[PDB]
C-alpha cells in the first residue's frame, strides 16, 4: 500500500455523487477522503417537525464515496470542537476493528485518519457506531455509502459490460420523533436532551417518518432528480437500519443488485427490489418514456404517508409503441 | 402495434387463473381485457368485521391477467356510475405515465382504454393509484396480478424447459380496519366515511387482518385449492403494499422466482420465499404426497392470528420413502 | 430405506454442531436422533424478566441435526410426563403430513418416531405445530435446524469446492413478553396462565425483546464465539418466525446462501444477508483480522436495544494492507 500513488478526491453533496470513471486502465490508488461530521437541528416535514440530527458532511445521508476494487480508501474523519458527542465511522467495504470503529473514536475537537483496503466490488454503507449509542447516531442521520466498482466496470449475468451516464445517491432513514402528551412532535433545545424520549419511540419498531435524504419531499419540486429518454441512471439506495422495497413508477429495475454486491450476477426486469436494513443496493434503468416518475418505497403508507417517495423528471420524446392512450376517459356508452 | 391480430379474453375470478397457453407458436397479439370497478363493504373475518372495500371486478384479488412477452395488453377499464370514488391503473408490468395511471383517471360513469407493451418477462403487480389517496385504494383492495409469459414458456436456471398443470393466484392483503372507543371494530354506512379512521390504523403500519383474497379462511374448507400426487401447480402470490413469506407447510418450491422475473434463473428447493410490497412473485411445486397442506405466510402470528393462510387438499398414493410413522405416539418406555 | 446402514447421532448443545463430515464417501444411511422437550421458565434479559418456555432438548434453539442429501432422517421424538401441553415437530426438509407435524403428536408422557427423505440439500427449519397454538410454540422457543448437507459438499457458483472449519448455530427469537399495569414484565407461575396475555402482545406484532440463543447476551463475553485468522466459519441462522437481517462487523459473508438451500449458487462479499422468517440460511467467512467481532440482526434497535447481537472472539495477527491506523485521534490542527 505504501508503494502506491495517492489522490485526493472532492466529495459533493447528495443526490449527486462525485466525478469517477467506471471501467478503467488506472492501477490501485491509495484515494483520499475527508469527512467532517455536524450535529444540527433539522427540519424534517411540511408542518415543520424537527430533528435533533448527526451527520456526516452536513447532509442525509453523507456524501458517497467511490473508489476501484484494490484501491485503499484513506479517510481523515474531523469532529469540531462545536458538536457536541464522541463519533466514529464503521465501513461495511472494511475488513478489521468494527469496520474502522474502533480505530477513529473522535472526541469533538479531534480527528484521525483511517486506511482499509477496498477488496471487494459493491455499493456498501459506512455509518457511526460509538460504543453504547449505536442506533441513536445511525437513525439520527449518521450513513452513507461508499462504491467501490471493479476496476474493468459492472458486468451483466453473462460477462457483458454495463454502464451508467448519470448516478444517484438516495439515503432512506426512519425517524423516531417523540410526543408530548398534547400529542405534538417534541422540540429540543439540544441533542443530548432528545436521547431517553428518542430510544422509547425506538424501541416500539414504528417510524413517525421515513424520509429520503433528510427531509419529506426532499427529492421533489426543484430538487427532484433529472434524466433523458436513452440515458442509463444508477440509483444507489441505502437504508442503514431497516428494510425497504425501492420502485420506480411507470419504470423497472433494468438490472439490480438488491443486495449491492458487484461480484453477483444482477437480476432483471425487476418492478421492486428489496434493500435490507444495514446495507446499500444499486439499481441500472434506461429511460425509454419522458415524464415525471416516482421513485419511491413499495411500502405504500411508508410512501405516501411517511415521506419515503421522490420524483425524476425525464426530458424525451413519448413512444406510443411502449404506450399509447387508445381511448381518453369519457362517459360509458 | 397496429399491424397485429387482435384477440379478446375472458377473465375469470381468483384463485382460478384464464385458460391460457405457456410455451406457444403464435405471434405477438393485441391482447383485449375489460375491468369492471366495484367498491363494496365486504366482511373479512369469522366475527363480521366489515371492510369498506374496494375492487377490480368485484374480487381480492383483481384477476389475473395472462399474456405473452411481446404481447401488447390493451385494458378498457371501466367506472361504473354506481361507485363513489374516481379510479384508475397503475401496471408494473407497464412502461412510462406512472404504469398508464395518468392516461386511466376514470371518475363513476366514465371509462377508458390503455395499451401497453408487455416487453418483460414475470408476475407484475396492478393497482390503482390515484393522485393523493394511493395507498387507500390500495390497502382498500385494488390490486391484482399481470402474468407476462416467456414466449417459449418457462425455464430452469439451464434453460431447460419447466412448466405448470394448474394456476392459482393469491393476493395478500393487509388491511387496517379501525376501532371505536369499546374497542370494537367500526362499521361505516359509506366508503367516504371510512377514510379518515383508516388512515389512522395505516400510519401505525400495524394491520388488524392479513388476509388471503379477501378474508379469513377464503382458500379454506369448500374454497381449499386442489391437485393431485404428480402434478405441478404454479402459486402465483401478489402482494401491494407489504413483504410476507410464502412457505407450503409439507412442501416446498420446487422452482421459484421471488422477485417474480422470468428472465432470471428461479432458486430451487425453497422452504420460505419472499414478496417484497410491491410486487408478484411465482413458485412451482409438484406434488408427492396427497393430504391437507397450508400455504401460509411464515410469519406464524401474521398467518394464525391476522388469517394469511389457506389450504390445498391434494388426492394420491402415500408415498413411505418420502415420509413414514415409524412408532406413533405411544407411551414412554 | 429399509435395505439401508442405520447411523447413531448424539446431538450436540447449540451454537455448537455435532460432529460430521462435510464430503462424504458414504452410501445414504438411516440416521437416528432423539430430542426430548423441556417446558420450562427462563431468564431473558439482564434484568430478570422471563419467559415460560418450551424447548427441544432444553434449549432455544433446538440443537442442530446434520445428514447428507438422500439419507433419511429417523427422530425419536419424547414428551415426558413432566410437560404439561402436547407437542410434535413439523420438518421443513420433509415432504408429507405438515412437515411430520401430523404423525408426532406426543402428549406428555407420549413418544414417537418418525422417519422422512432428506432429498434437498440445505438449512431448514424444525418447529414444534400444535392444531391451533402452532405461533405460542414456535415463539416460545420450539424450533431449530436440520441441516442438509451435499453428499459432495459445498460447492460455490462455479462449481469449485467451498468448506467450513468450523460451524456454529444461531437460533433468533422475537419474544413477545406481557407487561402488567403497573408497566412491568409479567411472571407466570405456570405456562398455561402466559397463553392469554402472550397472544395479545402477539398480535400487536411488535416483540419486547428479541435474541440470540434464549438469552439477550447469550453469545457475549464468556460465551463469545471463536476462531482464529485463516480459519472459516459457517454461521447458521434460524429465525422460524419473523425476518432478521445478518451482519458481521468488521466482517462479511464471503459465500452466503440466504435462503439457505445448497443447490443454488451463493452469493459472495455481503455486508448484511436476508433470512426470511420461518427459514434457516447459512453464510461462509474466512477470519483475515484478529479481534472481538460482533455478529447481529441489523437493524440496530433490534440488535442494541431488543437484544438480537453476539460476539465472535478471533485470534492471530492484525493485517495492516487490510486495515491501518494512519494517525490516531488526536486535536485538530
Ligand atoms: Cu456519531
Ligand atoms: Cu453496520
Ligand atoms: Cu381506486
Ligand atoms: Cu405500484
Ligand atoms: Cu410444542
Ligand atoms: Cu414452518
Ligand atoms: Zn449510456
Ligand atoms: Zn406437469
Ligand atoms: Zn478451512
Given at each position: 500500500?505504501?508503494?502506491?500513488?495517492?489522490?485526493?478526491?472532492?466529495?459533493?453533496?447528495?443526490?449527486?455523487?462525485?466525478?469517477?470513471?467506471?471501467?478503467?486502465?488506472?492501477?490501485?490508488?491509495?484515494?483520499?477522503?475527508?469527512?467532517?461530521?455536524?450535529?444540527?437541528?433539522?427540519?424534517?416535514?411540511?408542518?415543520?417537525?424537527?430533528?435533533?440530527?448527526?451527520?456526516?458532511?452536513?447532509?442525509?445521508?453523507?456524501?458517497?464515496?467511490?473508489?476501484?476494487?484494490?484501491?485503499?480508501?484513506?479517510?481523515?474523519?474531523?469532529?469540531?470542537?462545536?458538536?457536541?458527542?464522541?463519533?466514529?465511522?464503521?465501513?461495511?467495504?472494511?475488513?478489521?476493528?468494527?469496520?474502522?470503529?474502533?480505530?477513529?473514536?473522535?472526541?469533538?475537537?479531534?480527528?484521525?485518519?483511517?486506511?482499509?483496503?477496498?477488496?471487494?466490488?459493491?455499493?456498501?454503507?459506512?455509518?457511526?457506531?460509538?460504543?453504547?449509542?449505536?442506533?441513536?447516531?445511525?437513525?439520527?442521520?449518521?450513513?452513507?455509502?461508499?462504491?467501490?466498482?471493479?476496476?474493468?466496470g459492472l458486468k451483466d449475468?453473462?460477462?457483458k459490460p454495463l454502464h451508467?451516464?448519470?448516478?444517484?445517491?438516495?439515503?432512506?432513514?426512519?425517524?423516531?420523533?417523540?410526543?408530548?402528551?398534547?400529542?405534538?412532535?417534541?422540540?429540543?433545545?439540544?441533542?443530548?436532551?432528545?436521547?431517553?424520549?428518542?430510544?422509547?419511540?425506538?424501541?416500539?419498531?414504528?417510524?413517525?417518518?421515513?424520509?429520503?435524504?433528510?427531509?419529506?419531499?426532499?427529492?421533489?419540486?426543484?430538487?427532484?432528480?433529472?434524466?433523458?429518454?436513452?440515458?442509463?441512471?444508477?440509483?444507489?439506495?441505502?437504508?442503514?437500519?431497516?428494510?425497504?422495497?425501492?420502485?420506480?413508477?411507470?419504470?423497472?429495475?433494468?438490472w439490480?443488485?438488491?443486495?449491492?454486491?458487484?461480484?453477483?450476477?444482477?437480476?432483471?426486469?425487476?418492478?421492486?427490489?428489496?434493500?435490507?436494513?444495514?446495507?446499500?443496493?444499486?439499481?441500472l434503468?434506461?429511460?425509454?418514456?419522458?415524464?415525471?416518475?416516482?421513485?419511491?418505497?413499495?411500502?405504500?403508507?411508508?410512501?405516501?404517508?411517511?415521506?419515503?417517495?421522490?420524483?425524476?423528471?425525464?426530458?424525451?420524446?413519448?413512444?406510443?409503441?411502449?404506450?399509447?392512450?387508445?381511448?381518453?376517459?369519457?362517459?360509458?356508452?
Open positions: 500500500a505504501d508503494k502506491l500513488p495517492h489522490t485526493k478526491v472532492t466529495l459533493v453533496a447528495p443526490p449527486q455523487v462525485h466525478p469517477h470513471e467506471q471501467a478503467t486502465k488506472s492501477g490501485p490508488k491509495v484515494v483520499e477522503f475527508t469527512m467532517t461530521i455536524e450535529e444540527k437541528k433539522m427540519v424534517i416535514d411540511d408542518k415543520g417537525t424537527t430533528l435533533q440530527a448527526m451527520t456526516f458532511n452536513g447532509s442525509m445521508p453523507g456524501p458517497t464515496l467511490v473508489v476501484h476494487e484494490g484501491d485503499y480508501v484513506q479517510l481523515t474523519l474531523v469532529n469540531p470542537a462545536t458538536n457536541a458527542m464522541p463519533h466514529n465511522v464503521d465501513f461495511h467495504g472494511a475488513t478489521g476493528a468494527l469496520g474502522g470503529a474502533k480505530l477513529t473514536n473522535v472526541n469533538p475537537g479531534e480527528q484521525a485518519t483511517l486506511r482499509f483496503k477496498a477488496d471487494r466490488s459493491g455499493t456498501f454503507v459506512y455509518h457511526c457506531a460509538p460504543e453504547g449509542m449505536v442506533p441513536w447516531h445511525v437513525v439520527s442521520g449518521m450513513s452513507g455509502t461508499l462504491m467501490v466498482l471493479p476496476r474493468d449475468p453473462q460477462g451508467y451516464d448519470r448516478a444517484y445517491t438516495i439515503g432512506e432513514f426512519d425517524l423516531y420523533i417523540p410526543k408530548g402528551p398534547d400529542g405534538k412532535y417534541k422540540d429540543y433545545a439540544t441533542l443530548a436532551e432528545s436521547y431517553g424520549d428518542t430510544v422509547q419511540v425506538m424501541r416500539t419498531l414504528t417510524p413517525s417518518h421515513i424520509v429520503f435524504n433528510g427531509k419529506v419531499g426532499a427529492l421533489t419540486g426543484a430538487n427532484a432528480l433529472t434524466a433523458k429518454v436513452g440515458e442509463t441512471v444508477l440509483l444507489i439506495h441505502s437504508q442503514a437500519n431497516r428494510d425497504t422495497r425501492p420502485h420506480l413508477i411507470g419504470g423497472h429495475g433494468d439490480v443488485w438488491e443486495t449491492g454486491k458487484f461480484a453477483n450476477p444482477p437480476q432483471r426486469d425487476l418492478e421492486t427490489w428489496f434493500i435490507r436494513g444495514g446495507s446499500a443496493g444499486a439499481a434503468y434506461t429511460f425509454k418514456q419522458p415524464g415525471v416518475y416516482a421513485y419511491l418505497n413499495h411500502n405504500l403508507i411508508e410512501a405516501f404517508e411517511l415521506g419515503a417517495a421522490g420524483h425524476i423528471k425525464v426530458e424525451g420524446k413519448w413512444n406510443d409503441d411502449l404506450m399509447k392512450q387508445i381511448k381518453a376517459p369519457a362517459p360509458i356508452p
